[PDB]
Amino acid sequence: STGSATTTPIDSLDDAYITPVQIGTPAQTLNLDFDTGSSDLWVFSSETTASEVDGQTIYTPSKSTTAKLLSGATWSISYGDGSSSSGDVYTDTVSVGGLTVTGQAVESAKKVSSSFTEDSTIDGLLGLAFSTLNTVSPTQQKTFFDNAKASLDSPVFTADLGYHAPGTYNFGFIDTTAYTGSITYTAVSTKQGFWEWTSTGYAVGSGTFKSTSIDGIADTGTTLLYLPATVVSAYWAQVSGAKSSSSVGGYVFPCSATLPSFTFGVGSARIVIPGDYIDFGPISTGSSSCFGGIQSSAGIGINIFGDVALKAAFVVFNGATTPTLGFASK
């Protein structure tokens, strides 16, 4: 089997991407944030504290003939941005882009933090990291991908995120029309439960490539590119007037600037992030200070190849017995 679903930016900054997902019988379609940095499929629901719902579409298990309470199971998750959610668990039929899993754990939110409430466009998350990170207790649950894997034509999914445009998540096949050149594969460590890999270096604009190992995670659920302070300083030093602002929470630059590209290494291959992808616009409405899309990972504890980086590539998440990550230009 295979699946193919379009993923769409939630706003004009590509802050996140939503993908329609069918849950239950008859289908209830919710727009979920596919997150390769976590491993819980959770939804706004008929159980979510009413004051914490503001425009989201909810899953109502009592209206699904295939829903079953997973008795005694609870979940609770905290994300890198400080947001959180928790609740109880149902199993139900879940389909993505024509690919169906029966008995998927669907984590129903009883509580969500303010960031989730305030984002009316995101009805929940669909985790695509390794199932060892799943938070369901006392019986840990599998991700949609892990459940689907045995049925897939090939044990893979791909992320093809757009810049200010829709893109695609495919399951079970590699669309050879969706990228240019060849795919370069690189080793993954699953030790922390992430799609963790090591970039071979970077360049700023038309500058020389610096060969240096940068361990980080491929995380579709993080907006920006978070890299070591040395690398980030080298980038922003090439932008007149750019500076790190503790009041704003990162690097800012004059909105009048033209940003240089940023290149990262994948083995001997190179992925180029155009300068425009690094512009996250005014820090506040009407400001002439703009927020940068490359930020320091210092104090996160991990480097994160978020959407800014991933959307510059066609990315293969290879979940074979020895997992790997593939990157191609597009």
From Swiss-Prot:
Active site, per annotation: D35, S199
EC number(s) reported in the record: 3.4.23.22
Domain Peptidase A1: start-end pairs: 17-328
GO BP of this protein: proteolysis
Annotated keywords: Aspartyl protease, Disulfide bond, Hydrolase, Protease, Signal, Zymogen
The protein's enzyme class: hydrolase
Statement: the UniProt record of this protein carries the keyword Signal: yes
Disulfide bonds: C255-C290
GO MF, one example: aspartic-type endopeptidase activity
Reactions accelerated catalytically: Hydrolysis of proteins with specificity similar to that of pepsin A, prefers hydrophobic residues at P1 and P1', but does not cleave 14-Ala-|-Leu-15 in the B chain of insulin or Z-Glu-Tyr. Clots milk
Homology family: Belongs to the peptidase A1 family.
Protein known as: Endothiapepsin
Organism, as annotated: Cryphonectria parasitica (Chestnut blight fungus)
Lineage, opening ranks: Eukaryota, Fungi, Dikarya, Ascomycota, Pezizomycotina
Gene (name only): EAPA
Range covered out of full length: 90 to 419 of 419
